[PDB]
Structures are given as C-alpha cells and as structure tokens.
Amino acid sequence: FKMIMAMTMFCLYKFDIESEQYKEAVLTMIGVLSESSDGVPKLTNDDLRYLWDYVTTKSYISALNWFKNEFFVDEWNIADVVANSENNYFTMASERDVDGTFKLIELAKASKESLKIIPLGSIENLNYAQEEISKSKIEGGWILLQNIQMSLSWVKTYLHKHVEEHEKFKMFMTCHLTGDKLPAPLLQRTDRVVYEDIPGILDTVKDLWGSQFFISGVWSVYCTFLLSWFHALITARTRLVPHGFSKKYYFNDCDFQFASVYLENVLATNSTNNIPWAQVRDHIATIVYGGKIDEEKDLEVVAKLCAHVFCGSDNLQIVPGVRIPQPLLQQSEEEERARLTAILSNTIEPADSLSSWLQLPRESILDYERLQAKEVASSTEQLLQE
Amino acid sequence: VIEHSSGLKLVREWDVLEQACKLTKLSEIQVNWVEVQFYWLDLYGILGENLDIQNTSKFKSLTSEYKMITTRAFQFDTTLKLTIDSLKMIKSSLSTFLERQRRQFPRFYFLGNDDLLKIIGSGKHHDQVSKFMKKMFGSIESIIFFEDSITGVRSVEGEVLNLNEKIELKDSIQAQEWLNILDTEIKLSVFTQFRDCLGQLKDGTDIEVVVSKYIFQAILLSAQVMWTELVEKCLQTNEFSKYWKEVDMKIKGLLDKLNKSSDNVKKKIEALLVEYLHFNNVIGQLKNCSTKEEARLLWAKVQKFYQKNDTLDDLNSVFISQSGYLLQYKFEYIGIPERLIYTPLLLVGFATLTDSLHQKYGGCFFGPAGTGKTETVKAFGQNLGRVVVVFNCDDSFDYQVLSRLLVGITQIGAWGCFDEFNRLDEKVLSAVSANIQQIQNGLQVGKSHITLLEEETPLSPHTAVFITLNPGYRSELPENLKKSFREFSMKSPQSGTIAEMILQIMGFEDSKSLASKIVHFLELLSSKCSSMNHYHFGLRTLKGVLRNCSPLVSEFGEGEKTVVESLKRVILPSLGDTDELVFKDELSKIFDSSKAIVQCLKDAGQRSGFSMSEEFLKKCMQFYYMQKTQQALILVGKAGCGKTATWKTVIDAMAIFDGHANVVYVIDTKVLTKESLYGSMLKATLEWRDGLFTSILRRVNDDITGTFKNSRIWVVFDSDLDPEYVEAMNSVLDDNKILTLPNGERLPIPPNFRILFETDNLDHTTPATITRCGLLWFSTDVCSISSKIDHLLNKSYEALFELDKLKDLISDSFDMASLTNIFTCSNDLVHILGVRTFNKLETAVQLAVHLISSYRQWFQNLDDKSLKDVITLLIKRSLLYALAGDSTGESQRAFIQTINTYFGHDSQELSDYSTIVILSFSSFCSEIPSVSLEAHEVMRPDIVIPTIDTIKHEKIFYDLLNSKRGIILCGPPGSGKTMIMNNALRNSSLYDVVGINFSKDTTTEHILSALHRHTNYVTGLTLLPKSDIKNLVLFCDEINLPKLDKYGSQNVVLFLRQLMEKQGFWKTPENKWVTIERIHIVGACNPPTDPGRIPMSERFTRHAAILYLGYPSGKSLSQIYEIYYKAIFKLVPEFRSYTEPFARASVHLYNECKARYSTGLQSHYLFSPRELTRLVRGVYTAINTGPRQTLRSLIRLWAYEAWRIFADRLVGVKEKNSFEQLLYETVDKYLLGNISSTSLLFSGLLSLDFKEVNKTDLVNFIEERFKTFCDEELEVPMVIHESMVDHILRIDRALKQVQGHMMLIGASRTGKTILTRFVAWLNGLKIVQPKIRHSNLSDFDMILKKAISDCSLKESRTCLIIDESNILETAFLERMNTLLANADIPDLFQGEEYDKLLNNLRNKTTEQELYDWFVGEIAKNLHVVFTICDPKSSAMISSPALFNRCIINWMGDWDTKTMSQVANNMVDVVPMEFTTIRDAVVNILIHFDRNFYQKMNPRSPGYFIDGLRALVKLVTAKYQDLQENQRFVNVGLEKLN
Ligand SMILES: Nc1ncnc2c1ncn2[C@@H]1O[C@H](COP(=O)(O)OP(=O)(O)OP(=O)(O)O)[C@@H](O)[C@H]1O
Ligand SMILES: Nc1ncnc2c1ncn2[C@@H]1O[C@H](COP(=O)(O)OP(=O)(O)O)[C@@H](O)[C@H]1O
Ligand SMILES: Nc1ncnc2c1ncn2[C@@H]1O[C@H](COP(=O)(O)OP(=O)(O)O)[C@@H](O)[C@H]1O
Ligand SMILES: Nc1ncnc2c1ncn2[C@@H]1O[C@H](COP(=O)(O)OP(=O)(O)O)[C@@H](O)[C@H]1O
C-alpha cells in the first residue's frame, strides 16, 4: 500500500506538471506492468529509457524502487515519525509473523526512555497494566502493551474509558493486521504506524541465537543449532504467499519451544552413536510443524525440507554456501558454541538467497514478483480511473 | 388468590402492581415479595418436608423462618424487613454450606443445587443416589445393594463391579463420607482386579478362561501391559512370528467364544477383539519392517503401557509411553463402552495429544465435521483410564453451567473436552476464554490454587482442557488461547480400515472385499447423486449400517447378501428417485445383486378401503422393515403425497400380524404451544402445568389400565419440523430416552413408545437430527388415479337393492380411457392457488356421489336411458366444478366444451345453464326471481340482486357444502365474495353464519371465542352447535391475512386444516380429544399476487375445494344496475321511462374506464363494481336531498357524481379531458351543458337542498364561515383559493354521503388536515385527536367505544382525525378494512360490553333489529380520514375493503395558479411596493424553485410558506426599524435647524 500510494501521488504530480506524451508513456508502462497491453511508447528521455531497459530485463521491483528513488528524495523511519508528533499515543501495528517489540526496545535505548513491556491477559495482567499506566501518568515513561488483540474487549472498555498530561509521557500499542477490527476512536485518536521487517534470514538466526542461552553434551547444542536453522528456513519460506506454500501459515516461538523440548528429551534418553534421525524427522514433520498443515502438497514440502535439514549425513549443506561439521568425540560445549557462532559469522548471504537459501527454482520467484507486479499494476489502474 | 398444597396463600397478580409503582417503599415491598415467594418455593420443596436437613444454626434459622412464614400465612414493615434479611442470610449460609459440601466431595460439584439438596436430604433412604450416579460419574447407572450395604455398582452399558470388600451403612452417616470411601474403594478395586489379571496372564493363564471373570478395564490393562512387555522382549531380538501366531490364536478363540455369548459377554468380547485386532495390526506392521531403526520408529509411535514395579503406592503405578513422553494412569472405572477402531490417523492424534499434554498445554482440533474429533478425545480419555466430560456445545449452554463443570473438571482432575466450541455467544466465549487461559496459566507455573469464580479453588496437577473446532462455517481459536494451545487438523478418517475391522469383528468371512466395496459404494453415492441437503454418506451412516447388519446376519447369514440387504434397508428410503435409479445401477455394477407380511399388508389395505399398488406395497415393506429397528422414524413426501394412509395401513397390518393392541394419537405440534404441550412456570403463582405430551407420557408410563404392557403406542406429528420444538425432544430422540422438563421432574421411556414425524419438507431441519433418527422419503405419488377413485367410491358409499346397481352404473360411468385423457388435458389449464391434478379427485367424486344420493329417490320410476343421462350430466358438472373451479369464465366455457367432447355425442350434453329437475332437462335462465326493492334500502349494503351467475353459484354452493367438503373462495377483488356468502347463507334454512375477520395477527383463541357463543359442549368429549337442526358453518374471509412464522408456515391455517381433516383437536387446559360432528368451514380469500398476501401451504388447501369467483359479465351488471335505476327512479315519476339507457351508459363507461387503465401506472388504478354502487348511492342521496329535478339537471347531477367519484385518482389533465369527452359521448349517444369540474358545482351550503349555487355566493359563504371560525375558535391566518375550494367541495360531498369514506393525496403543509377539520366544523362533526406511542389497541378501543356510545346516546356529531403517524402496524389497517367493509366488527362487541350496549339500546328505544339499527347509525355517523404522503400502505388501495367505499381524491401539491393566488393574497397586507413588482418577485421565486427541484413525486410547499412568512416578518421588522431611524433623523434635523 505504501508503493501504491507513492505511485498514485507520482501520477497526480507528473500528469499535471508535464504534457500528454508523458501521460501516454506512463499509461503504456503501467499497462505492460499489468501484462494487459503491448506497445512501445513514444520515446524521445533518459529516465524513461532506463524504465524501458528495466521492463525488457523483466526486473519489475527494480523499476519500482527506481520510481521511488528517482521521484521521491527522502524516506521516513519510526524515529522520525515518533520525533515529530503532536499527540502522545501511538498504536504500533504489524502482522503475527513479525514482532515489533525489539524495535521499540532499541528505540527506548536510543531515546534513553523507560519502556515497560506489559503483555495483557488475565485480571492479574489487567491490574498490572493499570498499575503501570498509573505510574507512567504520575511520573512519566514509555508503556508497551504487547498483543492487545487477545484482550480486544478489555481494551475497548479500559483504554477507551481512560482516553475518554504528564511531560514526556508516551505509550505504545501492538495489534495484528490479520486480526479483529479495532474501533474507530482508537484508530483516529493516535499516530498510526506499521513496521515491516526485511527478511534477514541470517539476522533472525543471530537474534534467535542471542535470545537463547545454549542440556546433554555437544549433541544438544548441535541439534539446537540445526533446529534453529530449520525454523529460520521455514519462516523465510512462509513469506512467499502463493509459491512457497499454498496458504499463509504463521509459525512462532512456541513451536520452536516444543520442538526444542522434544529434541532435548530424545537426546536425553538416547545419547548413543545412532541418534534416531528418522524419528525426530517424522515427529517434527507431522506433529510439531505439521500440526497446522492439512494439504498434502504442504506436508510433502515440509517433509522434503526436513529430509534435507535433519539428514545427519557425513557432511551437510544447509545452503549452497556453507557446511556444518558435526561436533567430534572429545569436544566441550563452550568451544562448540563458539565454533558454531564462528561458522554463523563466516556465512555471507548471496543476493539470490530467496531462491537459493530455500531451495526454489528461480522461475518460481520470477513468477512471484510477476504476480506482485501484476496486482500492484492492477491496483494502480483501478485507482487512476477516478 | 390461590393457596398451594399447605399453608400460605398466593395472590394471582404480578407486574400490574409493578407498573402502578413505576415509591421507594413500594419498590422495597415488591423486592421483598418477589424474594420471599421465589425462596419459599425452594423452602417448601426442600426444607419444608425433609427432617434430616432440618434436625444446626441453619436448622434453627430454618425453623424460625418457617414459623415466621406460617405467621405471615395466618395474617408489618419491620416484620417483612426481618424476613428479607433472614432470607438473604440463610441463602448465603446455604450457598456456603453447599460449596463446602462440594469441597468435601468434588464430584458432587457437577450437580445443580437442588439435586445435591435432595441427595443430602436422603440421609436415611440411601437409594436416591442410584438414580443420580450416572450424572455424578458418567459410566455407572446404579448401585446394587445387599442388606443395607454396597457390593457392586452397575455400569451404564450393564456391567456389575465385584468389590473387594463391602461397606457397612450406619444410621448416623452422611452421603459424602460413604461416597468418598466408595469411589476410593472403586479405584482400589479396579487396581486389585488389574493386578490379579496381570498375575494370571503372566502365569500363562489362557485368555478365554479369564474373559468371563473380570471387568473390562482389568483385562484391558493386563492384556496391553503383557503385550507391551512381550513385544519389547521379542523386539530386542529379531523375531516376531511366535507372538504374531499367539495373538492370532487368541483372536480366533475369542471370536469362537463370541459366537456363543450372552449380551455383556458379547460387549466385553468385542471390545477385547478391538484391542487384539489393533495388537495384531501393530505386530504385523513391525514384522514388515526390514531394518532396526525403522522398527524402533514404528514401535515408538504406537501407544505403550508400562508399570512401576518399584513404587509401593498403587494408584500411580502404571504409566503410558508414547513417543518418549510419559503419562500416568489414574485407575478410574469406565465400564464397557464402544472402542474406536485403531487407525494410523488415530495414532497420530494420540501422539499430538501426548505432546500437547506433556508440557502443561492443551490439545486442539479443527477442520471438517463428521470426522472423528470428539470421539477421538473420548477414546484417548478411556485409554488413559479417566472418563472425559463431553460438553455438547450449542445455544442451550450458558455461562454458569460451564463455569461449574469446568471448576469441577479442575478440582477432580477429570479432563473437560469441548465439542464445537465455535457454537457459543460472544460474552460467554470471552468468559470461558478467560477461565481457560487462567487454568492453563495455573498449570504452566504449577501453582496449587487458581483464582476463579471469586474463590481459591484447589487444582490437581493431572487436569486438562480439550477443545475441538470447525472454522470457516466461523472462527479459529482466539489469540488468548492461541498462545497456550497446540492446533491440529484431523481431516481424513481412514474409513477403509474402520470398515475392515468392523467386518472382521462382526464375524464375516471376507472383510477385505466387503470393506473396499462398501467404501467405494459410499464414495460413489456421495459423488454421483444430486446434492440434496438431507444426504450424508460419510462415516456415521456407514457405522449405522454396519450396526444394523446384525439382525440380517442372524436371519439371512454372513456374506455380501446381508450387506446389500442392509444397504437397501437403510440408505434407500432417504433417497429421491433419480438417486434411487443411480443406487440400483451401482448395486448392479458393484455387488452380485417372507410373503406372510405381504399378505397381511394386502389384507389390511383391502379391509381399510385402500387399493395396493406395486410401489405402494414396496414402500410399505420398507417402512415395516425400517420401524423394525428404530424408535423414531420421519416420513416425508410432497403435499398430499399419501403418507398418512401408508402408516395407518402399516399400523393395522402389524395389529393383525402380532396381536398387540395398536393405540395411536395424532398431534399437530406447530399449532399447539410449547407451554400447552409440556408446561411452564407461572409468573403469578409459580405453578407447573402438566402439558399434553407430559400427560400422554405419564399415562403411557403409569400403565394403570394395564393396556400399555400388551400394546404398541404411537404418537405422530403431522406438521413441519420447528427446531425449537425438537430441541425439547432431542433427549427422547437420543439414546438417553429420558424426558427433560423445565420444572425438574423426569419421566422414563418404554421401548414400545415409537414417535413419528409426518412432514412434507426438510427446509429448516438441522442435519444432526436426521442422523439420530431414520428418514423415509416419498418422492412420487403413492396411488394410481383409478385406485384413488375406487377407494373414494368405497369410502363415500360406506359414509351413507339400489346400492349395488348404483355402484355398477357409476363404475361403468367412470371409464379410464376417457378419464386419463380428460385429466391430462385438464393438467395444463390456468389455475389460481394451484392444486395438483392428483388432489381434486376427492372433491369430484364426493360431489358426484352426493348428487346421486340426493336424486336416488326418483330413479325407481325412471328408465335406464334417462337415469344414465342424469348420472352422466351430474358427473360432468362435478368434474367441471372440481377441475375448472380455479379458472376464469372463458376457461369454464372451454372446459365445458371439452367435457362434452370426451364423453361422446351419445351422452347427455352439458350446457352452461344446464340443470336437472323433475326426470328431464331444465335451465337456470327461468329460475331467476324478479325482486323490486324500493329506494329506502338501496343504500343498505346487504341487498343482493340475483342473476344467472348468482343463482348458479348459490346452487353449486349448497351442493358442495352438502357434499361434506371445504370451501375456499378466491378471485379478483369486488366479485362480492362476502355478498354471495350472505346471500347464500342468510336465506338458508339448514346453515347459520358466524363472522370472523383475519388481521395480520390472529390467535386461535379468537375463533374459538367467536364460535363459543354458538356452540355447546356435550360429553368436552364432543362439540356441537348451540342449535339442534341447522349445521353451523364457520365463515372466514381475507384468510390469507395472518402472517407467517420464522420457518415458512402460518399456524392459523394449520389449525383450520386440523379442524377440516381430522375432524377434531385437543383442548389446551384439559389435554383431551375433541370431536366435531356437523360443523363445516368456508373460506374467502384474495389471489396471492396481491401485495400483502402470502401463498398458503398446499397441505391445508388440498383438503378443501377451491372455487374461482371472477368478475361478472357486462350484461349481468347491466341487468343489476337497471334494476338499481328502476328502484332509484321510483322516487321521481317523470323519468320512469329512462331507466335502461342510463344503466347501459353506466356499464359502458365503467367498461372503458377499466379497459383503458393499467395497474402498473398507479397503485389506485383498480376497478370493481363497488365504485358503481357508490355512484348509485351518491345519485340517490343527491336526488333525495334535492329540488324538483329536470332531465338536464339529472344529467348534470349524474356527471357531477361521476366527476366527484371516478375522476379523482388522476395524475394530470389529459385523462381528465378524456373522461370529460367520454361523458359527452355517452350523454350524446345513450340518453349539451358543460360538464367540467368547475361547471359542476352542486352543493347545499347555501340552500336547504343539494343544487348548483353561484360561485360568488359559495365563496362569500366560505369567507363568512372562515371569519366566524376565526372570531370564535382559532385565529389561523389562512387564505382561500380555487383548488382548495374545489377540494373542500369534494370532501363536503364525501362527508354528506352516508358511510362513504374518503382519502387525500397531498404533501406536507398542503392543508389536508386543516381542510378536514374545517369541513368538520362546517358540517358540525366534532373532532377528537388521538395522542399517539404511550397507547395501544386497548386505549384505542376504549376511546372509540366511548365516542360511539356518546354519539348513539346524545345524538352528537362525532368523527375522528387520523394521521399516518397515528397508525403504526398492519393490525390497525386490517381493523379499518373490517370497519369499512362491514359496519359492525364482530370481535369488538361480545360479553359484558355487548350486554351493556344492548341494554342501552333497549332503554333508548328484537336483538337482530337493534344490531341492524346499530349498523345503520355507525354507517351514518362515522367518517375516518386517511392521509398518505409517500405514494406500508401501498397495498392498502389494492385491498378490496379499503377501496370499498373510500374516495381517493388527488389533492396533490400546489400548482402555479394557486401559488400565485396565495402569494398575492399574502403579500397584499404589507406595503412592499416602493421602487408592479410583487408579481415579478413571486414569479422569479417560483421559477427558481422549479429550476432547483429539476436540478435536484410532489413538491413539498413547506419551504414556500416558511420563506414567505420569514420574508414578511423580516420586511416588517426592518421597515419598522428603518422608519424609526428616519423619524429620529428628521426630528434631529428639525431640532438642529
Ligand atoms: N391404496 C390407495 N388407494 C387409494 N387411495 C389411497 C391409497 N393410499 C393412499 N390413498 C390416498 O392417499 C391420501 C393420503 O393422505 P396423505 O397421507 O397425503 O395426508 P396428509 O398426511 O394430511 O398429507 P399432507 O402432509 O401432504 O397434508 C388419502 O386421500 C387416501 O385416499
Ligand atoms: N475409530 C474411529 N475413527 C474415526 N472416527 C470414528 C471412529 N469410530 C467412530 N467414528 C465416528 O466419528 C464420529 C465423531 O464425529 P465428531 O468428530 O463428534 O463430529 P462433530 O465433532 O462434528 O460432532 C462418530 O459419529 C463416529 O461415527
Ligand atoms: N352480482 C352482484 N349483485 C349485486 N351487487 C353486486 C354484485 N357484484 C358486486 N356487487 C356490489 O359490489 C360490492 C361487492 O363487495 P365485495 O366484493 O363483497 O367486497 P369485499 O370483497 O371487500 O367483501 C357490493 O357492495 C355489491 O353491492
Ligand atoms: N395555504 C396556507 N398558507 C399558510 N399556511 C398554511 C397553508 N396551508 C397550511 N398551512 C399551515 O400548515 C399547518 C398545518 O399543516 P397540515 O394540516 O399538517 O397540512 P397537511 O394536512 O396537508 O399535512 C397549519 O398550522 C398552517 O399554518
């Protein structure tokens, strides 16, 4: 929607400052973008020549961010939008597959402001939130209410009655876009904001490594490493809505918790040389990660990914760039953690990771960007008719 | 006031005093009263009878308050304050006592407070818990007693538990302590049994000899533990064949014992066979493995049972191994329930539930329904050895019951599942969501106590919560649960292996082919056939079929024949017809393929009068074989498909077959209220009513007569399926078979009590109910037409040397060759309220047989040819009036030529005016009588002028009513349906009328109260009319008016169908059958195409006979109206020779007035002779109230009436000029002065009689009346103009007419109501204004009765003003429709009001004469007004009753001429002309308005008058201020100079 609003504003400006040949060039370029029309525009400048070279190269989003960079000369982050705010209430929003708490924590560390993480819940959680908002209305601070969608009615009574001023007093909400409809007074009496995490596959692996703290020997840590890598791989593959999976599932930290407990209990009862890789493989593919999956093709895909990740052969290639040697007999867990962190930092992400870190043919991801280009072009075409 | 069983008296008055009080003291009094009776209910029910729960401080308070309430019964504010304080105190005390009792025994906490009170009060009976233990536990039905002790408990399936040691029962004991030791000993005893079974099995004891010794759980746990140990031992090595063969031999021996077993032994053997089949399946899977790690994989998923051999405590010494997670058995008894067949998907479900429960979470389920979720949860609970409390969620469940059951599930440690969680309301879902989140919060951190329900309850660490869903039908889990649960999808039940194991366990020789074939067959049936909403071919139906196979296994044998026979018996009756041929084709493709009952059905049908056909016999056999098993069958066919005879024939056939008495009761459930059928709690005296179904259950269960022990009892429901009428019966339908009542008492169910649903469509049936009961579908008609005719002949003959010869003659008269041709040719005709050609045969044969019976007393002196001619002509007339009776007159002629055709030229030809009299021909042409009424009663609205059609319809009316059949009359409005009713029944000598009128909302008690004044009760057992010789007939008109229900039906016509078909019903307060002997019912209705009408169900109209009543012919109206004009010209003798041409002109002008208009242009463009009647009446009153008229004066008066009646619904002026030229043409053609609206100005406000006055004279009189009104009553500054002069002239002619009402079409502020009140003052009629909200029908009727009584007593001139805001609902519109069509509405005046009115009339002056005078006076002095501004009342004009006598005068909006008039006459009183210009300003103003309205249907002139008044006042104020300023300036200038 950001790109769509950007493109509509660009069309509104350049359709009135410039002549009609520019308008015809824009129309035919959007038509080729939607794969609806065929025709060479009445070429004369250099920018439109670059656009034509882009669309002949079939690099759609390249041309789209070229639009964004060539016309617009600046961008706004969360820091700028929270810097200049007449109001003091911000309802941060995201999806359920991407967290937004750690960005707020990093902002609070940068802004040297006291942030209180207050996940709602039972009456005890409601009393905790009430005490925290009373404290931060008495002496200031920053308040985060994490995942308020689960207490929509509690929000609709308590927060609405509270809003219907202390210096340096700010608070933050958190809601999921694919959830329940929020009331109109809550939406319009705030500075709306939404955060999109770039899919940093190595970055989320580093964050998951730092979030944890590691237990049965070197095999426990090595299996935790492999499981974290598999969770990151499947979380990256679930971003591709029409190609990676037939439906948009949402795996989270609880699934990793259950998979970790299962692996720990398997390795605890079996520390032998022949670790039952097939048993943990099927158990994860059908029960842990296969719990929410019903279509046969999705099960086959998750089974293939598990067979590639948890094979446990002599040498393993999680991505075509790096390899994982297993810990040997006379190894200790601290140096093993250091070695795995080193082999994580040794890894450099190639630019084609979305088609090489997830085992997908390149034609599939070109098809995905073709579909996204078609839908954004169709949205622009519908919006420009008024 | 009425007193209950002892002591206190209770007053029968509530919420009336609440409305009266709605001070603070009265509110406190009401609160104290409601709490004292609402608690004294339970005090008398519990505390007032049982001595053990009153014989410490609570008991003393009980005695003290009993004494206080006894004193209050014997005979104050402080006393009642003490009583309310004590009642609150004891309620808190008893609630705390009950809570701590449930704390002492947490399993008590399942029950309601009353049942626990009863259990505690049973301190010496010691057997009131035996009827509650199933609800207490879930798998134990009763406790066996051996000499005031306990030695066993009886499982619900029927297993007794051999306890280790009995328990003594002392006198000074309470239920809770001995039940504590009972259930603890239950767990100990099942452990002991398991231990000895395990020891025996480990010793090598054979399975068969220990099968018949111990309970299910002991042998189950022992077999599983030994299986696990031995498979582990033989898995450590690489051999499996030995234990495989051992398990195979054990299975074979167990099956051999199964063949020779009793009931409970069979249940135990089949459940053990399920377990052993699963063991053999797992072992065979393991033997097929090739490598050790895959063997360990396959063994790890399968459920593994272990035992602690080191822990000395025994209630946790057995634990369950599943995928490395460990669950501990709890040793709680489950009985012998059905075991789910073990399938790989079931193992996966077990594994994911083990994973969910390992880490203090809960499982979840969502996906398709009918898939095996709740049963999987139950099977998992049984395998862990605790019974799970399934909550079948629906709209019945509310917050407090789920709170109690969940807290009990917590405190016990019993798992609480949740079936279909998406079926909950929002707030209860939120509350249970918070509770479940708190429970998982407590389980995760392991805290001992969780703070819920405002308490601190204990929590066992073994509890759980299970949930199953169905999203998208809906919702998924909310996030607050989604953070603490494990979702899972269980979409595919492995139906192949379930069928395989069930065919193996039933003993069939080849389970593989049978299982594969039946799965393939059911999938092909689910795919190929049409997707009807009542089909289901998943797994539940397959399980039902396999359960029903066993009696046919016993009868036929074991093989494919049994399976296909079961398939034919079960699924086929629910199929259609194309589905049936598909099913037959698939049986032929897939599979390979007792006359005593046939003879019995044939004999029962022959004796009952019906005739058997091939398909009728086939379906009767299907119904017999299907009622062989189930206790709840539902039949379905089309309307009149022929099912009642089917089940009655089966009833009598089985009465012959088995010799049991067959007692049947017919009930129509949708006309009987739920309160009357079952009962309710009173709001006045808190009493319980024994409903009809409760009464019949008590009768059939008491068995006092002793007949029900040797008889089969049937109750049928001949109506639709109301869902809230089956949610109260689902307990009866389900396997519980226990009556559920709102009061608290429960009633059992005998196996002979078979319940039948007799319906025609499954439009609003939940598919769950059609699974719990068998369904039978009647797709096609169950008869041939010849068979139906023959049966109807036999029934008609038995309903009565001449009889047999008459039968032979009629039989040869009905020849099927011509009959099939005529019925096929009659199928395609135009019909109204369409009824099929299979239905009208009953009316045809009954009318023909009754004619033959009525003329049978002359045939002995008649030849064969004349007799045959008479019979054939009567048959032809009967077929015409039974088949063509729903078609127009021209279609009637076409039908009469056709029926004359197919019987040949030799037979007696049927004429349109054909009649048979003494035998020879006749004709109805000479039967018309010449009646010459005088002009004194032409205005009387009950007079009838006979014609050919009137006498023909009266003759067929008497014929068919005497033929014992029902009349429903339909036709276009205006055909005199009420008029022909009164003509054909008031003149009758054998019948009498009772009048009912149907509104949008009619109750069944209205018609019963109406007929109560003319009927008497005899024993009631039978209802007869108040008379003795004349058959009273019930007359209903506008019967389509009452509204439908929420499920596509209306109760009132179903009640009429009950009156017609079954000849009886059940009285509500006594629940006793009534019988009706000689009461017929006749109906009158409009076509369904009119707005505000609904199509009646064919089920009701099929029993009656319809009769189309179309518009009369032009010559008929010509004759009637020349009789009218002769009667009206009896007054004036000079024009007595000009009667006919005026009638011809009137009918001509009406004819082109109807032909030239279409109803699609305006909703008031409808034509029917009522306007011609009011034309005659207006001419009559003008002539009677006029001077010596001349021919030209008569012509212009007639044209004046024509303009003031006809030409008032017109949009523009072109049609007005067309009417004027039509009037000119008629006057010049059939026999000139101007006949325009302004040229015809007849009035009576200037002289003593109706005549044409001067325009100046009338406007001067209007101005004088206006200035007198302004000086006397109200100072309203209005102005006169031409359009309002014409409109008030029209409305004054309307008011001067008697009973001729009026209506106006104009916008807001157009002066409609002002004009009406002004002409009301002018004519002297007083005006009363309704202060309508805050009033209803009661206040309306009271005020109207007071005004009518004052008018009839003091001769006051009274009328009522009505706004469209005053009218709200359609009931008012129907009331005014009745008030206009009739003059005396029957429902208003009856009883005390009628007696008072009749006494007042007798004092002021027979009863009939007084009623007629009341009709005359209410016609003379009543004129209501109807205002419409948006041309809800759109269909009101289309109603014949509102259009009957109202005048639809198009007032309209102001036009340019009258706008100019009002503008110039308004601005003429204020000086404005300073710079003519008033004309300029008004014309530019109106041009601006026209442009504005055409830039953005009448013009509302509110803006006009508001702007003109605001402009006038602003100009006057500004000019006064300017004049003051100018005068001050001039004064200052004069002073300075
Ligand atoms: N063998 C037969 N021969 C002749 N007529 C038969 C035979 N079997 C049934 N009928 C006729 O079928 C009809 C049975 O009535 P039916 O079962 O349709 O009544 P119902 O329950 O009131 O119907 P609905 O529910 O449609 O109102 C009767 O009119 C009866 O004469
Ligand atoms: N071993 C089994 N495996 C799977 N399903 C079974 C088994 N045994 C019986 N069933 C069927 O599963 C059905 C349970 O349906 P259920 O999940 O309760 O549907 P819903 O949840 O929509 O009420 C039962 O009616 C039963 O016929
Ligand atoms: N055949 C007829 N003979 C005499 N009057 C008739 C005839 N047909 C119609 N009318 C007149 O038409 C009117 C019929 O009214 P009706 O159709 O009974 O109204 P509703 O259907 O609302 O009861 C009566 O006022 C009657 O005077
Ligand atoms: N010709 C008129 N000139 C001035 N005022 C008028 C005129 N006609 C109606 N009114 C005003 O309208 C008010 C009531 O209008 P109302 O009777 O409701 O009109 P209608 O009956 O057409 O709805 C009166 O108080 C009167 O002052």
Residue numbers in the entry:
A (entry chain A): 3694 to 3737, 3741 to 3860, 3867 to 3916, 3920 to 4091
B (entry chain A): 1385 to 1406, 1435 to 1467, 1473 to 1492, 1505 to 1902, 1905 to 2024, 2031 to 2237, 2244 to 2361, 2366 to 2466, ...
How do the authors describe this structure?
Cytoplasmic dynein-1 (dynein) is a highly conserved molecular motor that moves toward the microtubule minus end, transporting various cargoes including RNAs, membrane vesicles, and viruses, and plays a crucial role in cell division. Lis1 is a dimer (~90 kDa) with an amino-terminal dimerization domain and carboxy-terminal β-propellers that bind to the dynein motor domain24,25. Our data support a model in which Lis1 relieves dynein autoinhibition by increasing its basal ATP hydrolysis rate and promoting conformations compatible with complex assembly and motility.
We purified wild-type yeast dynein monomer (amino acids 1352–4092) in the absence of any nucleotide, plunge-froze grids after the addition of excess ATP (500-fold) at two time points (0.5 min and 30 min) incubating the samples at 4 °C to slow nucleotide hydrolysis. To understand how ATP hydrolysis affects dynein structurally, we built models of different high-resolution dynein conformations identified in our datasets. We mapped nucleotides to their binding pockets, as all our structures showed nucleotide densities in the AAA modules. The intermediate linker dynein has partial density that fits a model in which the CC2 has a slight bulge in the stalk and is consistent with a semi-bent, also called semi-α state that could represent an intermediate microtubule binding state. In the straight and intermediate dynein state, when Lis1 is not bound to dynein, the linker interacts with the AAA2 H2 loop, but these contact sites are less resolved when Lis1 is bound, suggesting reduced engagement in this region.
